[PDB]
Design an enzyme around this catalytic site. Structure first.
Site, PDB file in Angstrom:
ATOM      1  N   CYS A   1       0.838  -1.133   0.062  1.00  7.55           N
ATOM      2  CA  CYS A   1      -0.068  -0.230   0.027  1.00  7.55           C
ATOM      3  C   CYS A   1       0.873   0.980  -0.057  1.00  7.55           C
ATOM      4  CB  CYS A   1      -1.087  -0.078   0.979  1.00  7.55           C
ATOM      5  SG  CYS A   1      -2.384   0.723   0.591  1.00  7.55           S
TER       6      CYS A   1
ATOM      7  N   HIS B   1      -0.355   1.328  -3.249  1.00  8.14           N
ATOM      8  CA  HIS B   1      -1.867   1.866  -3.674  1.00  8.14           C
ATOM      9  C   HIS B   1      -1.780   2.988  -4.410  1.00  8.14           C
ATOM     10  CE1 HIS B   1      -5.624   3.894  -2.418  1.00  8.14           C
ATOM     11  NE2 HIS B   1      -5.819   2.445  -1.886  1.00  8.14           N
TER      12      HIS B   1
END
EC number: 3.1.2.-
Lengths: 188, 188
Positions: A106, A126
């Site tokens: 992420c 992400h």
């Protein structure tokens, strides 16, 4: 021979799903996982206010290496704390020097940028962390849900955490163990 | 008007992924979530040895109702502890009597059987918990990843936890909020 060992570095503001899913799945694979608190031994307040008690401080856990994988959860604030830590820098540089796996999810991969780890690798993050990760063009960006370029393993978000964790298991313990761990989880 | 409220009952041996994913996703939806420790205020050792500090004891949290949803994580030992608790029985019977949502995942639904909750509903469980849940034929079994029959919402395993949590969000806050919460998660 011996069981593999994983160091999961847990900072304030970490994404708790991205912490717990890899810890749990790695333990299902028989990996000895140490959840190490960046700040010390005390409980850690994650991004969505789940409070997790680490197994050890990072200060203590770092003296008990080497680890077969170092895992960096995401969470925007957690990754910023990882990125600011000299202890994290030293651990990641040692892991890279000994050709050990580094796995980050992420916003977690942005700590690789901060510590100058793995430049020239394909990576994912992400979507909202892409611009930060790509500042300077030191990596090549991927939209794969999990990306692995040699010893740099990255992934995108809470919803890719099972895939990320199983990729770590596959890298350390092989595809058959990963498949056996996967089946009871009821993944789609 | 007021924010919705969720009670997540956390017992020793709970599946930590099935605890953290719903707590986090519900908080992303703006739901006020109380993680309540079955045994008291102290940290809880989950099935894969993640240690979570509850927000409150169940003893205290139960006096602060009513809640829009009561959530039962799974984990074989956690669900057995939920099934043995007179406090859990009382909470679930009150929630059923006031026509409030009850949500349970993996082995969690077997606590509904123990407390005689929701008989005559379609339910799912983890495949390995089916026989326990179906003892006596008091429910009709479903293989759907998430099942909802009125106010009894059930799901199957760690790998259905995001779907389960988003179904709770949809039930309490509507489909649009659930869709908005879902998109940043990078689910497949």
């Amino acid at each position: 021979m011996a069981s593999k060992r994983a160091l999961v570095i847990l900072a304030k503001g970490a994404e708790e799903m991205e912490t717990v899913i890899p810890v749990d799945v790695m333990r299902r694979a028989g990996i000895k996982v140490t959840v190490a608190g960046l700040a010390g031994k005390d409980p850690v307040q994650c991004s969505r206010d789940v409070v997790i008690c680490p197994d050890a401080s990072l200060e203590d856990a770092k003296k008990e290496g080497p680890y077969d994988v170092v895992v960096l959860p995401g969470g925007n604030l957690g990754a910023q704390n990882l990125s600011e830590s000299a202890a994290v820098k030293e651990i990641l540089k040692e892991q890279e020097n000994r050709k050990g796996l580094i796995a980050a999810i992420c916003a977690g991969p942005t700590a690789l940028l901060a510590h100058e780890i793995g430049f020239g690798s394909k990576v994912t993050t992400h979507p909202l962390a892409k611009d930060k990760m790509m500042n300077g063009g030191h990596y090549t960006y991927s939209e794969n849900r999990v990306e692995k370029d040699g010893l740099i393993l990255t992934s995108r978000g809470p919803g890719t955490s099972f895939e990320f964790a199983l990729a770590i298991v596959e890298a350390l313990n092989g595809k058959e163990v990963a498949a056996q761990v996967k089946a009871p989880l009821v993944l789609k």
